[PDB]
């Protein structure tokens, strides 16, 4: 498998891991996910409303459910922010 | 670091590796990036124009260049397809 394929699999298996048989994640799931997979970020975000605000944007329909694609939209936004930051300050 | 951070780095460094200092991919870089990452995918499409059609949806501006965010829409597009297949047939 290539590195790209291992990476895509890790992101697929991640979401499933926190989503359960129910196939989606609640806000209770986003937080944990975010805690165990991005440790230096919510805690370093100073605010206590961290997760709620993430989810605001993830949940159009306010049904309290985050599915795969919206999950991907989270990762996309974090990855593109890091890339922006990398190209300017580090590349 | 977490698995997720490792996955994101690997995608962002994968971009930078085929794009070089110029910071963007061209059609040729896109095809080499698919040949080396995802070599079971292209060739199993039976279409020798596959790359060209991918490039076509990715070049909003028709300027022949694929930035980080279009490359990312391409990876989301494959990841989300991989997950719809996996939920239905493999879990």
């Amino acid at each position: 498998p290539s590195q790209m394929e291992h990476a895509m699999e890790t992101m697929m298996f991640t979401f499933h891991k926190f989503a359960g048989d129910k196939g989606y994640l609640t806000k209770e799931d986003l937080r944990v996910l975010m805690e165990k997979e991005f440790p230096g970020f919510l805690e370093n975000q100073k605010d206590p409303l961290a997760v709620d605000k993430i989810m605001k944007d993830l949940d159009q329909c306010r049904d309290g459910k985050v599915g795969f694609q919206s999950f991907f939209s989270l990762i996309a936004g974090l990855t593109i922010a890091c890339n922006d930051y990398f190209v300017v300050h580090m590349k | 670091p977490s698995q997720m951070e490792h996955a994101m780095e690997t995608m962002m460094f994968t971009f930078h590796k085929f794009a070089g200092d110029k910071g963007y991919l061209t059609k040729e870089d896109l095809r080499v990036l698919m040949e080396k990452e995802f070599p079971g995918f292209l060739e199993n499409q039976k279409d020798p124009l596959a790359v060209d059609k991918i490039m076509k949806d990715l070049d909003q501006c028709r300027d022949g260049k694929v930035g980080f965010q279009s490359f990312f829409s391409l990876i989301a597009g494959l990841t989300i397809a991989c997950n719809d297949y996996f939920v239905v047939h493999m879990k």
Partner: peptide, 11 residues
């Protein structure tokens, strides 16, 4: 190791 540190600069 590099995404971890940049996330920290976004945090």
């Amino acid at each position: 190791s590099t995404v971890h540190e940049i996330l920290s600069k976004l945090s």
